[PDB]
């Protein structure tokens, strides 16, 4: 357990590989899968009840402007947005997008 | 083990919290810590020998233009860049920055 970050990196990649098993293409993910992959890997334990609108914001992000593919980075940007949305801080911080700025 | 991604998210946040213990401010991380935090949490097991220049690129990123603070997202952008740099693909893919594009 000297370097658990390595497996956690593996957890993000290993879990991601499992979803690619449903379709077959592991070189890319569809933003719609962000909705299904988000709840399938994080159902109530995330959208339990705190900041329910945030789930809709992630869903509304798929409806942002021109959403179509998920690169390894886009899935992480969404996961990172999910972490800041609620990683451990008790303060309800919205997405990384500014309000008036 | 139904949802290991939750702990892995905790692994990134828990390990990150441990480094904040060295200084004291957990609301931000210094890009220099990216160099020390990168090797301290991922020493040889990463810069083992494959794509050694990549470590210098991460280090050169701190020397990019105006580097000073690491937001939760910047640390993840660097971690995401590290994952794509070598998450599981055997192809040596550089950073997420394009070459001529």
From Swiss-Prot, chains A, B:
UniProt GO MF annotations: actin binding; calcium ion binding; calcium-dependent protein binding; chemoattractant activity; identical protein binding; RAGE receptor binding; RNA binding; transition metal ion binding
Compartments (UniProt record): Secreted; Nucleus; Cytoplasm
InterPro entries: EF-hand-dom_pair (IPR011992), EF_Hand_1_Ca_BS (IPR018247), EF_hand_dom (IPR002048), S-100_dom (IPR034325), S100/CaBP7/8-like_CS (IPR001751), S100_Ca-bd_sub (IPR013787)
Keyword Cytoplasm: yes
Binding site for Ca(2+) 2: 63, 65, 67, 69, 74
A cellular component term, taken from the record's GO annotations: extracellular space
Protein keywords: Acetylation, Calcium, Cytoplasm, Metal-binding, Nucleus, Repeat, Secreted
Binding site for Ca(2+) 1: 28, 33
Biological role stated in the UniProt entry: Calcium-binding protein that plays a role in various cellular processes including motility, angiogenesis, cell differentiation, apoptosis, and autophagy. Increases cell motility and invasiveness by interacting with non-muscle myosin heavy chain (NMMHC) IIA/MYH9. Mechanistically, promotes filament depolymerization and increases the amount of soluble myosin-IIA, resulting in the formation of stable protrusions facilitating chemotaxis. Also modulates the pro-apoptotic function of TP53 by binding to its C-terminal transactivation domain within the nucleus and reducing its protein levels.
Oligomeric form and interacting partners: Homodimer. Interacts with PPFIBP1 in a calcium-dependent mode. Interacts with PGLYRP1; this complex acts as a chemoattractant that promotes lymphocyte movement. Interacts with MYH9; this interaction increases cell motility. Interacts with Annexin 2/ANXA2. Interacts with TP53; this interaction promotes TP53 degradation. Interacts with CCR5. Interacts with FCGR3A; this interaction inhibits PKC-dependent phosphorylation of FCGR3A.
Protein's name in the database: Protein S100-A4
Organism: Homo sapiens
Gene: S100A4
């Amino acid at each position: 357990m000297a370097c658990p970050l390595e497996k956690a990196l593996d957890v993000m990649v290993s879990t991601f590989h499992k979803y690619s098993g449903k379709e077959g293409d592991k070189f890319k993910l569809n933003k719609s899968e962000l909705k299904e992959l988000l709840t399938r890997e994080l159902p109530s334990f995330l959208g339990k009840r705190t900041d329910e609108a945030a789930f809709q914001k992630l869903m509304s992000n798929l409806d942002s402007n021109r959403d179509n593919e998920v690169d390894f980075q886009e899935y992480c940007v969404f996961l990172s947005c999910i972490a800041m949305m609620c990683n451990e801080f008790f303060e309800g911080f919205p997405d990384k997008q500014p309000r008036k700025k």
